[PDB]
Assembly symmetry: C3
Homo-oligomer: 169 residues x 3
């Protein structure tokens, strides 16, 4: 009949770029075409072998670029091939309180909510060990933050961008 | 003044069809005019007498048509009278991830959320023993699933439709 | 680029009027210019000195006007100065089930949800000891209720208005 209210647009626009992290004898986000992926520290602590899994079926072995114990963030590196799904980033967008946000983690689950505060970034979107290290995007799909660990916490994409660049030293 | 953002439309369109189940010395959904009602198995296990209560005030004694231990579903039957409120069904609607959904259970409570995954159907709408067996509809009121038992689970209306038809054997 | 789905409008329209309550050796809401503030009883029980903190930075010492053990409500009084941010009230608005609502409490956190029932007022917006006594507004910012203590509870603004007026005796 008509159009059901949905945020699927932001899903098919951001979800592809979110991956799953594993250990061969956690969540992650594809930042740029170079193949850099932001995740969490507690996800890679004592990692024998880091593995990345895309939604399209592709599987990679990830390289630990570096981590930051302060913000619990970590950067990974995979062999950038032809055609990588990257997380939509908008450095001009200013996260206002009340903005609708989706939390993308892991089975690939999508929770809905809003920006509670911007003190870090608080959100009422269901966060857990599954989506810990996943993405946080607005209705447009623009990355607002990186989920961390009755209210959830993420790291502003602005900050995460900086920290990522510094870990590449 | 102006119009407050609301999903009341889907409420006055689906809520009437959702009923309450009891035992005379759980939730349920009115499917068709014939008087068939889908509920959960754990709701009728060891039932002395099944009772159905509509939102309009009408009260009925329900008949156990049959259950399916696999999907935890059950079908009831009440004497179809003149004028039954049926749950809006749309077999053409395809549940996409990110779609806004309401969870209708039981006091008649309405929780809001989205479709997390479609693996079953995951949703961040608050689900509990109250709405266990209730309806799950989009902003249009179209039945998306039947709630079951930090993330909730429902059964695709497509599947539930089949299983219901088979229990009528 | 474009416009991200958000309820920030209701925030910059209601949040200023919500304050924080303290005890000098809880949440509250600025009702009118006179300086009357609605809060919860359990927040002021055994209070040595009641203190009110606005979002603009202003700090006041509050006066206990009176409380109502029944609805767990309480009314405070501060020296009404020039220019007070008051909570948007609309006595003509009728709270329908399914309406989008924000819960404003305390760091100043904003949770999103809907009106579940209107029996009291039920809401799936995350409520806790933080926002206990805070505001509950629709997408327009119009006060729908006062939060109290897997589902949250508030008091209809219609009722709270009456009880407030009676405590001023």
């Amino acid at each position: 009949d008509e159009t059901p209210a949905s945020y699927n647009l932001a899903v098919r626009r951001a979800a592809p770029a979110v991956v799953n992290v594993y250990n061969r004898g956690g969540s992650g986000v594809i930042m740029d075409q170079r193949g850099y992926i932001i995740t969490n520290k507690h996800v890679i602590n004592d990692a024998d072998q880091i593995i990345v899994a895309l939604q399209d079926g592709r599987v990679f072995e990830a390289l630990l670029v570096g981590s930051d114990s302060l913000t619990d963030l970590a950067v990974l590196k995979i062999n950038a091939t032809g055609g990588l799904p990257t997380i939509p980033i908008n450095a001009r967008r200013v996260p206002h309180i009340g903005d609708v946000v989706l939390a993308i983690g892991n089975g690939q689950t999508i929770t809905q909510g809003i920006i509670s505060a911007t003190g870090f970034l608080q959100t009422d979107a269901s966060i857990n060990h599954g989506n810990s290290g996943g993405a946080l995007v607005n209705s447009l799909g623009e990355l607002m933050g990186i989920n961390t660990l009755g209210i959830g916490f993420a790291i502003p994409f602005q900050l995460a961008t900086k920290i990522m660049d510094k870990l590449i030293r």
